[PDB]
Design a protein around this motif. Structure first.
Motif, PDB file in Angstrom:
ATOM      1  N   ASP A 101       0.832  -1.204   0.000  1.00  0.00           N
ATOM      2  CA  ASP A 101       0.000   0.000   0.000  1.00  0.00           C
ATOM      3  C   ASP A 101       0.870   1.259   0.000  1.00  0.00           C
ATOM      4  N   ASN A 113       2.517   4.559  -2.640  1.00  0.00           N
ATOM      5  CA  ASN A 113       2.410   5.335  -3.861  1.00  0.00           C
ATOM      6  C   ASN A 113       3.794   5.463  -4.498  1.00  0.00           C
ATOM      7  N   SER A 114       3.854   6.179  -5.624  1.00  0.00           N
ATOM      8  CA  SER A 114       5.104   6.263  -6.374  1.00  0.00           C
ATOM      9  C   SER A 114       6.179   7.007  -5.589  1.00  0.00           C
ATOM     10  N   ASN A 115       5.796   8.065  -4.873  1.00  0.00           N
ATOM     11  CA  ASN A 115       6.780   8.859  -4.141  1.00  0.00           C
ATOM     12  C   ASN A 115       7.402   8.060  -3.002  1.00  0.00           C
ATOM     13  N   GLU A 116       6.584   7.310  -2.261  1.00  0.00           N
ATOM     14  CA  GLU A 116       7.109   6.523  -1.150  1.00  0.00           C
ATOM     15  C   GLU A 116       8.013   5.400  -1.644  1.00  0.00           C
ATOM     16  N   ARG A 117       7.619   4.717  -2.720  1.00  0.00           N
ATOM     17  CA  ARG A 117       8.482   3.685  -3.290  1.00  0.00           C
ATOM     18  C   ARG A 117       9.787   4.284  -3.800  1.00  0.00           C
TER      19      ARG A 117
END
Ligand SMILES: Nc1ncnc2c1ncn2[C@@H]1O[C@H](CSCC[C@H](N)C(=O)O)[C@@H](O)[C@H]1O
Lengths: 451, 10
Positions: A422, A424-428
């Motif tokens: 769960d 988003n792109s920024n956290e990954r």
């Protein structure tokens, strides 16, 4: 036969066994019937559970006996279970590709209960008749009267669902009888204030010791002169609304060190610790230990570092930081949720200054969601605490993700993936970045397999 | 007791 020279009836009688027949007791040669005795556990009075206690004091590293019972193979035991409804693996020992079941025939070892924090004995693989068997070896010096505890080395959800967090002091006496034996040390007072952490309200009648009253009055135990030492961990006896004492299975008691850690009395905490207070004493139902109550007080009380000092002292006294709650979350799991980054790093630095033997033992534990301490930090978006944890153990991925057993490697990979699911792109992106900048020399294949 | 190796000897 030579069996005719073994009268198991006298063994059962001297060992205080009342739930077995003569033909169902299987003795061994190293059985020390003189050192222990089978008695009852008042906490397990409803289920009718018993336990093994020490008749005399026992040193550390002493042979207790061999786990005896009916012998089966791994397939024959499953067939017995499938053909006999009601059978269970509660008394089953899986050793050397064989199953020793003591659910109907056994020896004195079948009465030892479970503990993954205060275990005073352990199972060791040995040989008898050139065959692999298991023996019980004391891991600590036993005081006469205490209950023997051991780790079953197996996990089941029913255990962490309703296993009473046992302490060696948990014996066969009830609360009323225990108070009757020590009536001289207990006075009945009323609660001056409220205690959410102990389910106590103002005006509730409580039987407490002098040490407990001193702790509750915010006094100093050192300023008192004549303080008895036997009532060091004599707990706080709660009184019910019928003006009768609540029993152990009816309510959870606590010790002076628990209340001291919850209130933040650093000097009284040190006094209690140096006076032989069980720093790993746990509540029966909830399982709250001094560390959990210290974390609760840290989360509640505005002044913060006062509990950091208590945690540092507990770590300095080699407290078992491997305790867990009924959610299978260890001390570090919950501590990362209640401590700020600075105080969390301070506790990590305390543990580093101790420099434990094997660091990987802190990472092998997983919660109900199959997340370790690093996966826990990454599931709650606690990136900096995960970074400092990786700073503690740099070989975390090298040992757990890149080992010989590909099964464990893939399991850790899938667990980390389920944790970062769960996102988003920024956290990954920031996760992969921080992984690369960490200098842990992570190969590209895992960085691809991770997500 | 819930380790990565989810009674026994050891
Ligand atoms: N920590 C614990 N709290 C409550 N029950 C426990 C326990 N550890 C073990 N038990 C119980 O004891 C069994 C293990 S075999 C131990 C002997 C048995 N308890 C007896 O008194 O004769 C299990 O079926 C479990 O129900």
């Amino acid at each position: 036969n030579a069996d005719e020279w073994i009268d198991t009836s006298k063994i059962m009688l001297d060992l205080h066994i009342d739930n077995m027949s003569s033909s169902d007791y299987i003795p061994s040669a190293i059985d020390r019937t003189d050192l222990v005795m089978v008695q009852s556990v008042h906490l397990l009075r409803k289920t009718g559970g018993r336990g093994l206690f020490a008749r005399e004091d026992i040193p550390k590293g002493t042979c207790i006996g061999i786990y005896t019972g009916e012998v089966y193979s791994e397939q024959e035991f499953e067939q017995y279970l499938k053909e006999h409804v009601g059978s269970d693996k509660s008394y089953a020992m899986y050793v050397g590709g064989r199953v020793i079941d003591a659910a109907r025939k056994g020896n004195l070892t079948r009465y030892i209960n479970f503990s993954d924090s205060q275990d005073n004995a352990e199972f060791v693989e040995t040989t008898l008749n050139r065959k692999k068997v298991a023996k019980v070896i004391t891991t600590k010096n036993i005081k006469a009267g205490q209950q023997l505890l051991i780790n079953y080395n197996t996990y089941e959800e029913q255990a962490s669902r309703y296993y009473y967090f046992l302490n060696p002091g948990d014996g066969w006496l009830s609360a009323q009888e225990f108070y009757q034996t020590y009536q001289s040390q207990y006075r009945l007072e009323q609660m001056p204030y409220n205690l959410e952490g102990f389910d106590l309200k103002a005006g509730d009648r409580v039987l407490m010791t002098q040490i407990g009253r001193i702790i509750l009055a915010n006094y100093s135990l050192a300023k008192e002169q004549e303080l008895n030492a036997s009532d060091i961990d004599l707990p706080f006896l709660k009184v019910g609304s019928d003006e009768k004492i609540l029993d152990f299975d009816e309510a959870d008691t606590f010790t002076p060190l628990m209340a001291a850690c919850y209130l933040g009395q650093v000097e009284n905490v040190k006094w209690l610790i140096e006076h032989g207070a069980n720093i790993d004493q746990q509540q029966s139902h909830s399982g709250h230990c001094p560390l959990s109550l210290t974390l609760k007080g840290y989360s509640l009380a505005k002044d913060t570092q006062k509990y950091i000092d208590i945690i540092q002292l507990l770590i300095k006294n080699q407290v078992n930081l491997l305790v867990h709650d009924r959610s299978d979350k260890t001390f570090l799991h919950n501590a990362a949720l209640v401590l700020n980054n600075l105080d969390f790093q301070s506790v990590v630095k305390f543990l580093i200054g101790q420099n434990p033997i094997d660091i990987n033992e802190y990472f092998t534990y997983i919660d109900e969601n199959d997340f370790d301490i690093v996966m826990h930090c990454y599931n709650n978006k606690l990136f900096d605490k995960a970074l400092v944890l990786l700073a503690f153990y740099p070989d975390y991925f090298k040992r757990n993700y890149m080992s010989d057993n590909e099964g464990h490697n893939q399991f850790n990979i899938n667990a980390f993936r389920k944790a970062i699911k769960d996102f988003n792109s920024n956290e990954r992106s920031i996760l992969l970045m921080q992984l690369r900048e960490s200098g842990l020399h992570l190969p590209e294949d895992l960085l691809e397999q991770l997500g | 007791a819930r380790t990565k190796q989810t009674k026994s000897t050891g």
